[PDB]
Design a protein around this motif. Sequence first.
Motif, mmCIF file in Angstrom:
data_model
loop_
_atom_site.group_PDB
_atom_site.id
_atom_site.type_symbol
_atom_site.label_atom_id
_atom_site.label_comp_id
_atom_site.label_asym_id
_atom_site.label_seq_id
_atom_site.Cartn_x
_atom_site.Cartn_y
_atom_site.Cartn_z
ATOM 1 N N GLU A 1 0.843 -1.265 0.333
ATOM 2 C CA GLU A 1 -0.049 0.018 -0.160
ATOM 3 C C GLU A 1 0.430 1.319 -0.509
ATOM 4 O OE1 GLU A 1 -3.222 -0.274 3.149
ATOM 5 O OE2 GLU A 1 -4.197 1.072 1.769
ATOM 6 N N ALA A 2 2.483 1.043 0.286
ATOM 7 C CA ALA A 2 2.874 2.197 0.851
ATOM 8 C C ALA A 2 3.507 2.519 -1.210
ATOM 9 C CB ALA A 2 4.268 1.962 1.330
ATOM 10 N N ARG B 1 1.726 2.093 -3.892
ATOM 11 C CA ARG B 1 0.481 1.860 -4.606
ATOM 12 C C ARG B 1 0.773 3.336 -4.220
ATOM 13 N NH1 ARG B 1 1.127 0.971 -7.573
ATOM 14 N NH2 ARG B 1 -1.044 2.394 -8.404
ATOM 15 N N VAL B 2 0.169 3.834 -2.964
ATOM 16 C CA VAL B 2 0.102 5.451 -2.438
ATOM 17 C C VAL B 2 0.531 6.230 -3.273
ATOM 18 C CG1 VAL B 2 -0.779 7.626 -1.007
ATOM 19 C CG2 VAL B 2 -1.996 5.180 -0.649
ATOM 20 N N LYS B 3 2.236 5.856 -3.138
ATOM 21 C CA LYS B 3 2.718 7.223 -2.889
ATOM 22 C C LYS B 3 3.616 6.632 -5.005
ATOM 23 C CE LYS B 3 7.798 8.212 -2.326
ATOM 24 N NZ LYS B 3 9.185 7.072 -1.508
ATOM 25 N N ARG C 1 1.461 7.062 -7.320
ATOM 26 C CA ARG C 1 0.348 8.581 -8.201
ATOM 27 C C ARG C 1 1.049 9.457 -7.426
ATOM 28 N NH1 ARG C 1 -3.640 4.929 -9.225
ATOM 29 N NH2 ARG C 1 -3.099 3.793 -11.470
#
Lengths: 186, 234, 51, 103, 144, 142, 126
Positions: C44-45, C47-49, C51
């Motif tokens: 998740e780190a 994935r978010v970073k 974009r």
Amino acid sequence: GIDLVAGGRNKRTKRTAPKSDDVYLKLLVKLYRFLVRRTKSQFNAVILKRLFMSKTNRPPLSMRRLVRFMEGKEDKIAVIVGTITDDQRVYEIPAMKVAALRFTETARARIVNAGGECLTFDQLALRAPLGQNTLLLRGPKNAREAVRHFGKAPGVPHSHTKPYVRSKGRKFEKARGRRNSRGFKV
Amino acid sequence: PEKVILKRRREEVWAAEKKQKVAAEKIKAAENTKVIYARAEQYAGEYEAQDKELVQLKREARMKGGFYVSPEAKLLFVVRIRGINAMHPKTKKILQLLRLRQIFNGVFLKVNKATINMLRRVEPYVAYGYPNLKSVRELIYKRGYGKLNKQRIPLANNKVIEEGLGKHNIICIEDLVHEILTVGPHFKEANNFLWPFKLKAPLGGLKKKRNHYVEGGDAGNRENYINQLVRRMN
Amino acid sequence: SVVKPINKEVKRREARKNPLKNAAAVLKLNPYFGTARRMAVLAEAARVKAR
Amino acid sequence: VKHNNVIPNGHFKKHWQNYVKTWFNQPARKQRRRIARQKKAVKIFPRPTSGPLRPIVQCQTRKYNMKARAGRGFTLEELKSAGIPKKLAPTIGISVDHRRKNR
Amino acid sequence: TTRFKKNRKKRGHVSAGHGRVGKHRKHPGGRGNAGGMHHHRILFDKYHPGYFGKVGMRYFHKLSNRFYTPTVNVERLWSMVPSDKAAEAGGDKAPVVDVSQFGYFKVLGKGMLPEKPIVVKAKLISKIAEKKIKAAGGAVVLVA
Amino acid sequence: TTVPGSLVWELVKKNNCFLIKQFGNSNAKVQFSKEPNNLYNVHSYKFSGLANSKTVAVQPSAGEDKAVVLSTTKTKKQNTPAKLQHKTLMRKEFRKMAKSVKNQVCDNYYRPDLTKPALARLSAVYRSLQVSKSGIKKKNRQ
Amino acid sequence: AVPLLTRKIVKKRVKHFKRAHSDRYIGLKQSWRRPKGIDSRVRRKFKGCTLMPNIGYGSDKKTRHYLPNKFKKFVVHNVSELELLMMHNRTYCAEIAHNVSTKKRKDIVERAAQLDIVVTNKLARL
RNA sequence: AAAUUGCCGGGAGGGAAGCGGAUGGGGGCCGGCGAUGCGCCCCGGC
RNA sequence: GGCCGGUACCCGCGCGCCGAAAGGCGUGCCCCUCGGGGCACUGCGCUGCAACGCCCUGCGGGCUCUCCAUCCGACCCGUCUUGAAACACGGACCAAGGAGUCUGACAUGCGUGCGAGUCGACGGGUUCUGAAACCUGGGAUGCGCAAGGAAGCUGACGAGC
RNA sequence: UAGGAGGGCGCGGCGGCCGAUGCAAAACCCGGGGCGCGAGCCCGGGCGGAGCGGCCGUCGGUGCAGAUCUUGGUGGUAGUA
Ligand SMILES: [Mg+2]
Ligand SMILES: [Mg+2]
Ligand SMILES: [Mg+2]
Ligand SMILES: [Mg+2]
Ligand SMILES: [Mg+2]
Ligand SMILES: [Mg+2]
Ligand SMILES: [Mg+2]
Ligand SMILES: [Mg+2]
Ligand SMILES: [Mg+2]
Ligand SMILES: [Mg+2]
Ligand SMILES: [Mg+2]
Ligand SMILES: [Mg+2]
Ligand SMILES: [Mg+2]
Ligand SMILES: [Mg+2]
Ligand SMILES: [Mg+2]
Ligand SMILES: [Mg+2]
Ligand SMILES: [Mg+2]
Ligand SMILES: [Mg+2]
Ligand SMILES: [Mg+2]
Ligand SMILES: [Mg+2]
Ligand SMILES: [Mg+2]
Ligand SMILES: [Mg+2]
Ligand SMILES: [Mg+2]
Ligand SMILES: [Mg+2]
Ligand SMILES: [Mg+2]
Ligand SMILES: [Mg+2]
């Protein structure tokens, strides 16, 4: 609501303790509750529940039948939760070591005079805490007179049940239903 | 006194023996947690592969001009939806065999021609469908109880599973999940081990219990929609 | 001479620990749970970073 | 009448409660007979308290002919053979039986 | 013992255990063995077959003593022998037991006998009883 | 106890002259034993002053100040009632008498059972002797 | 003098189980009798009718027979019976029997004072 | 003793009253109804 | 946000330092390589969560007691009956009395004693509060120890799976 | 429900044990305090004025709301016909 018979609770009954308030039999029961509890002898479990038994579930054993059952195994101890009665029809009895709740006076003399031992159940737990080298014996349960009257009714086919009759002789329970010349033959 | 020292020495022997047993056990516990950790990784691993493989297979067929018929379902979750009053004797007997003798009790079933033909005869009384990983896992952790010596023992820990099943190489709750979900060689043993689930009355309600799920009621087969009903009774 | 080791243990039912959201209860059930969480927590780190 | 029992046959259809004999006077019967025996003993002293001499007889009836018991009295021949006159015997303590035979 | 009678446990219960519908009425089936061939016919035929009818022939003025014949088996003859006299014996020398002095008339043949010869002296005896006594090496004597 | 103690307990358990039982045979039953060699006056075979050869007594003496009497019976004198009991009169200080009780109840393996009960009964007996003399001072409800 | 009980006493019901219809008749006693009638709506447990005693009302076995004092009572008749509570003073409270005279009660109270025994009728008959 | 009745004090009432659960208001009653003691210490005596 | 619980083990605490306390502080291997992460050797003992209040003989605290008010519930019991609140019967009220007992025969179960025997139950003897207790007989009294036959009669030769 | 069993409660004697009472026993009365799921029980206050209670075993003419129940007493009807 849950679909169960009598709430899933046990409906059978067993004796969890003896009926007699006999102080010595009460003491014996405490010993064997301890022995079954700590030693896990399967023999000890049998002895305990047989101690919780009525006089008719612990029938006597004659010395003739005991002598037959011991024959050739005289390096072991006969164990009967019950009474040993003397039998006059026997002549040979080996020297044998017998544990029982009671001995009749004539029985105990016959056993001792053979060079045997009349042990109690407290003495047995000293000499066999796990019932090792024992011959555990019952007496004939279905040998009572009352048992003859049990089972199928006296007047049905293929039953050999003893009828309750006040007397014997020709005038008592012989004519109609007991022979072809008087009605029918049961 | 001899009875005094005679008694202390055996207690020292007995106390000495216990520490050896406990010393052995922490070692076995250390081995177990690595073994349990090892098993859980591959179980987590292969579920992900199974999900991805079906997606892959269906995609391959579509580009070929055909289509992939998915494997037929193997595990049912069956929940009782009707009370116990005024029951027909044959319906009563089957629900006893299915271990569903109280409303909102749930059990897990194998699909069989023998099994499916038992649900057809008690269908107005039960709702059932195909459970998934989340439903099978949350049921077993949250509401899972073991049948140890005829007694209902909560599966709060792994030793209950080891002593419950053990012989069938079921050692942890996570392998108990796997044994149930991917119906395995010991599904019989690991599913009889689980005591019938005791579920909440469904948060949010039911539709008309008196009708089949197809009509808009709640009885019968609701294949994957059983998972929505699990969320609300769990 | 024949009795088994005396047993003075009194073991009782243990209180319930939340089997799905209690750290020392999930882990002692499924030791791999800590890793499995952290894998996607780590992803998740990314994935978010991203974009 | 009901379950497998013996055929009941009690003879209680008359006014039996008017002929009930209870035995509360049994201990008093023993005492009166004891006083009677004791009073008799003094009035016959020194004669023996068992009574006159009774002869040996075999009992009747197959079942008992192998058992000897006391008879009523000596026959006339037994008395005469021992030389005890007929009319003297009861006066000296010996019973007589003019009916018994010696076969 | 009135305190353990069960009617003391039904105090406060209306019917005293006999039912509301079918009551405790006086004699609803008749008295005694009424109806042995009418409305108790199943019970008499089931539990007491042979009850009705006349079998055999009368015996005016039957005296029991005429029919008295106590019996003993051979298996019980050696309890009759005292131990010291059971010792005094040879191969040919055997104790003699007058069963008449023990209250027995006939000797029957049930049970076994030890090898020691015996002379049974009785009023009556069966085939097998003498066959077993001879087979032990002893003899039988008839008396009255 | 000319017969064993386990046997004697069987005979005197349900009925004897010292057992004062109240409030029936239901779950309201309260029962005590007023025999003098029972430390807690409890009707049990552990504390029974009847069904034991080895028993301990802790009593305040007769009219006299600060004298605690400690008694222990004798295992081999069971059939000599008069000289079965070995009693000792202690008018020493509490901690010193707590030593005497241990010496004769615990350290000799007489009745390691009644180590706690004997001391606790000494504590209660001894305090009753102070209060008898000094009079009530405290109320002890705190 | 300080009670051992460290747990609050919960009663599931404080009202008594009065007999049905003893409020309607005078010769009916208030002591509980279970209705055996065939149509009895008390026996059949309709709502709004008088309640019947069940085992379910039974009070916790731990705090059973404890008085609001948090002591359990034992009725004494003399000083000897009082001295049986010497070692139970934090669980049992004495109470003088209703027919013990004023003279005897003064003795029990004096003796109970020293042994520190809670007595619940210490002021009666004086 | 009860049924039933009179007097004094108190309470409530629109074609019954009584009853079961709740609680609110009044009464009436409850001081084991609810504690003031224990540990360190400094003397000043027992 | 609601209800329950408050720890004698599960958690937790001391054994080192810093810190009011949260909490932090060490080393080595593996991992990406930021953050930092994961594993590591483990030992001894100990082991009922807290902080402040209010009242303290009061116009206080509570009460299972009494009366009253209000909301909800709520037909009169016993009985026979498929069905009773019944336009089914009995019951104006109160007190006292008021109904599965005694006996004989049998049966199953259970307890006690003795046991191929077992009963002393009609008598006798003895017994100074006892009409009790205690002793005695029985070698054949009852029942049991053997049965099949209408009867005359005959009457269990020894068990294998 | 009909019905069966177990464990208790209560009443009156008998054999034993342990006790209360003219410094006030039994019975009865109470808006007194309590215990027990309950049968019931314990205590307070009053009245009364001489007997009574608990425990173990054992025993019984042993528990009432009814029976157009038995006997006695009492109401409403009604200061009415
Ligand atoms: Mg035929
Ligand atoms: Mg909602
Ligand atoms: Mg709906
Ligand atoms: Mg329908
Ligand atoms: Mg009933
Ligand atoms: Mg009946
Ligand atoms: Mg009727
Ligand atoms: Mg009928
Ligand atoms: Mg009919
Ligand atoms: Mg009938
Ligand atoms: Mg006809
Ligand atoms: Mg009905
Ligand atoms: Mg009045
Ligand atoms: Mg007024
Ligand atoms: Mg109301
Ligand atoms: Mg109120
Ligand atoms: Mg009709
Ligand atoms: Mg109508
Ligand atoms: Mg009619
Ligand atoms: Mg009328
Ligand atoms: Mg009456
Ligand atoms: Mg005989
Ligand atoms: Mg009487
Ligand atoms: Mg009566
Ligand atoms: Mg009446
Ligand atoms: Mg009635």
